[PDB]
Amino acid sequence: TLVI
Amino acid sequence: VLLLDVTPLSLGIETMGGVMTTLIAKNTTIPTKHSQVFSTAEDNQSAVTIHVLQGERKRAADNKSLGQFNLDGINPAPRGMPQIEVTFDIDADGILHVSAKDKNSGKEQKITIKASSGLNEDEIQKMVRDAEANAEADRKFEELVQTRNQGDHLLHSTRKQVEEAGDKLPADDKTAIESALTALETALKGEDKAAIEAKMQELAQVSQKLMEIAQ
């Protein structure tokens, strides 16, 4: 999972 | 000068909460190459799934998937501490290449996508229809994710600050705070935005003295  | 090879649709990656984060905009002139940096969602995260999207929708799913790849050997760190630089590169031939580079490890992983990949000239125009047609529906979708994550942050950073404090925090307070976390962690599981803000409100008020110490 990627976040800004 | 008479023609112009352009992107008919926005290109980007799925980011936390199932939102599409655009990397290269609609109606962009090729060749083009933009980069942007991201990070991890859970602590001690060792890999990230780059999931590539085409289309104008905010929900990742309402968009066209182009491919998907992992970058692993992420050395254990706090969440949102790694530097994952996702780059989108389109050359004169229309070919899209997408890398992710861990700026610590110095590792890398690229997927190449043929100019013929993703939606045909018709679907492109439907995408733009269903975009304008659901502008608000996705406007409601976006600000909920933002709230989910704004919530999800507040939870994590409080649990840290509670460990950080320990003895220093009145059991009185640590009860009121530990209940309001549990409630907020449940609120997050649902889809009710209001409720998430409701438990973030409850946390904020009963946490007055916790904040003080951290400062």
Side-chain angles (χ1 to χ4, degrees), chain A, chain B residues 2 4-29 31-32 34-41 43-100 102-106 108-113 115-124 126-131 133-135 137-138 140-147 149-159 161-162 165-167 169-205 207-208 210-215:
Chain A
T1 296
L2 257 164
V3 347
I4 307 216
Chain B
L2 224 57
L4 260 202
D5 263 284
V6 303
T7 65
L9 290 169
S10 291
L11 299 175
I13 72 161
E14 177 172 357
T15 65
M16 192 160 76
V19 57
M20 169 170 178
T21 304
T22 294
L23 252 298
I24 297 188
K26 182 204 205 279
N27 311 134
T28 299
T29 53
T32 184
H34 300 110
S35 306
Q36 187 177 332
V37 172
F38 308 69
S39 204
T40 52
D43 292 326
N44 191 8
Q45 226 200 286
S46 55
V48 297
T49 278
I50 313 309
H51 170 211
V52 180
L53 307 164
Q54 183 191 4
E56 296 310 288
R57 304 295 243 109
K58 299 281 152 174
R59 211 178 301 267
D62 303 332
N63 287 287
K64 177 59 172 176
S65 195
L66 290 180
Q68 167 160 247
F69 73 91
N70 319 318
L71 169 61
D72 73 1
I74 301 174
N75 293 332
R79 85 198 229 170
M81 228 44 187
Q83 287 169 56
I84 307 299
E85 192 211 75
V86 187
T87 313
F88 281 49
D89 191 320
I90 320 205
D91 42 27
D93 297 26
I95 305 151
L96 162 68
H97 323 255
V98 179
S99 68
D102 175 347
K103 286 194 164 218
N104 178 253
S105 72
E108 193 181 66
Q109 266 293 314
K110 330 164 73 154
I111 188 170
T112 290
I113 273 131
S116 56
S117 299
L119 299 181
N120 74 34
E121 193 178 324
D122 277 19
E123 289 152 83
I124 289 165
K126 194 214 171 165
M127 185 59 71
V128 187
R129 273 191 272 149
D130 297 33
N134 307 44
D138 299 356
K140 280 275 201 214
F141 170 69
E142 246 199 335
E143 62 183 36
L144 165 67
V145 184
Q146 173 171 203
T147 312
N149 299 325
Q150 276 181 24
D152 176 63
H153 169 283
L154 195 71
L155 172 67
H156 185 290
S157 37
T158 301
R159 288 182 162 168
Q161 288 167 338
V162 169
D167 336 60
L169 181 70
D172 249 305
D173 273 52
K174 193 192 158 166
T175 308
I177 286 147
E178 279 202 312
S179 339
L181 290 181
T182 300
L184 172 56
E185 188 166 41
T186 304
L188 291 178
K189 301 231 286 283
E191 320 285 358
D192 186 324
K193 160 177 164 171
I196 292 160
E197 335 173 298
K199 302 294 133 207
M200 283 162 72
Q201 209 161 232
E202 192 183 355
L203 210 69
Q205 303 162 332
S207 292
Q208 257 213 63
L210 202 218
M211 294 306 93
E212 234 163 40
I213 302 160
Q215 204 311 75

